[PDB]
Design a protein around this motif. Structure first.
Motif, mmCIF file in Angstrom:
data_model
loop_
_atom_site.group_PDB
_atom_site.id
_atom_site.type_symbol
_atom_site.label_atom_id
_atom_site.label_comp_id
_atom_site.label_asym_id
_atom_site.label_seq_id
_atom_site.Cartn_x
_atom_site.Cartn_y
_atom_site.Cartn_z
ATOM 1 N N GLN A 12 90.132 -22.496 63.588
ATOM 2 C CA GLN A 12 89.421 -23.757 63.598
ATOM 3 C C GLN A 12 87.979 -23.513 63.147
ATOM 4 N N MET A 13 87.685 -22.311 62.668
ATOM 5 C CA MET A 13 86.396 -21.942 62.134
ATOM 6 C C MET A 13 85.301 -21.974 63.189
ATOM 7 N N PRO A 115 82.202 -17.994 53.239
ATOM 8 C CA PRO A 115 81.626 -19.236 52.750
ATOM 9 C C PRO A 115 81.909 -20.466 53.591
ATOM 10 N N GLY A 116 80.810 -21.069 54.010
ATOM 11 C CA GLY A 116 80.831 -22.300 54.769
ATOM 12 C C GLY A 116 81.005 -22.103 56.263
ATOM 13 N N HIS A 117 81.495 -20.952 56.745
ATOM 14 C CA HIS A 117 81.750 -20.776 58.163
ATOM 15 C C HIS A 117 80.479 -20.782 59.002
ATOM 16 N N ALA A 119 78.127 -22.896 59.256
ATOM 17 C CA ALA A 119 77.881 -24.222 59.820
ATOM 18 C C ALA A 119 78.263 -24.345 61.287
ATOM 19 N N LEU A 120 79.401 -23.737 61.625
ATOM 20 C CA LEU A 120 79.886 -23.724 62.982
ATOM 21 C C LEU A 120 79.871 -22.367 63.646
ATOM 22 N N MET B 13 80.915 -27.755 51.966
ATOM 23 C CA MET B 13 81.953 -28.545 52.608
ATOM 24 C C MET B 13 81.502 -29.958 52.936
ATOM 25 N N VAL B 43 88.769 -19.954 48.635
ATOM 26 C CA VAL B 43 87.717 -19.824 49.649
ATOM 27 C C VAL B 43 87.047 -21.161 49.967
ATOM 28 N N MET B 44 87.077 -22.116 49.026
ATOM 29 C CA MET B 44 86.430 -23.410 49.212
ATOM 30 C C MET B 44 87.216 -24.440 48.412
#
Ligand SMILES: [Cu+2]
Ligand SMILES: [Cu+2]
Lengths: 128, 128
Positions: A12-13, A115-117, A119-120, B13, B43-44
């Motif tokens: 769920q990241m 990448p992007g993880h 954020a959380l 995202m 990856v995205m």
């Protein structure tokens, strides 16, 4: 625990904690990362990376740019205090570092550079 | 635009709109998705999927479970009203669906089903 913490990163990241307190009397500190999910590394790889709060953005940005083969971390990145490898589901990895690399009064952040993880998947760490 | 919207998904995202309005006068509605970013599909990757607000969680759980080769969407899922393919950097895809599939006073949600993205990549669609 005392000079160790166990952290999980999931499908769920998210990480299961967003604050780590390192005790001033620890000579060394260990982060044990386990990934209890089902997705593969190339789509949901996680790692645990520590830097000061002010450097986090450049570590994530340069990490993203080094790619999956570099475990999304700039090789010999001076801003990274300690880090695990980028692992996938069912894998575990640990890193032990010397507490004397931290100083009281500085804000540290731990995060995932996939990448992007971030954020959380981010949290604070502070030596107290 | 008249019975159409152009929408972008980025490497952070995020979709460039979080609310789509469909006019009841439209026979059909088209959603044109583009990814101007640089990170690849594994990856995205982003897709645009539509279901009722009620079915979104089931569509997301089952999507995650279908795997990268199935564009993270369950095959022939009855709850998906319309969706694009899962695309990456530099790609574009369009979906046109009949407005008769939407009912007045039902809440719809659009979202990305690539693992980890739906909690951030989502928005509302309504029929007016
Ligand atoms: Cu991660
Ligand atoms: Cu996405």
């Amino acid at each position: 625990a005392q000079c160790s913490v166990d952290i999980q990163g999931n499908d769920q990241m998210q990480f299961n904690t967003n604050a780590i307190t390192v005790d001033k009397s620890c000579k060394q500190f260990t982060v044990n990362l386990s990934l209890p999910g089902n997705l593969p590394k190339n789509v949901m790889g996680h790692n645990w990376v520590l830097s000061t709060a002010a450097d986090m953005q450049g570590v994530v940005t340069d990490g993203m740019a080094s790619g999956l083969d570099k475990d999304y971390l700039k090789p010999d990145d001076s801003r990274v205090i300690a880090h695990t490898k980028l692992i996938g589901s069912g894998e575990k990895d640990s890193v032990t570092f010397d507490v004397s690399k931290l100083k009281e009064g500085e804000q540290y952040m731990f995060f995932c550079t996939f990448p992007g993880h971030s954020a959380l998947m981010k949290g604070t760490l502070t030596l107290k």
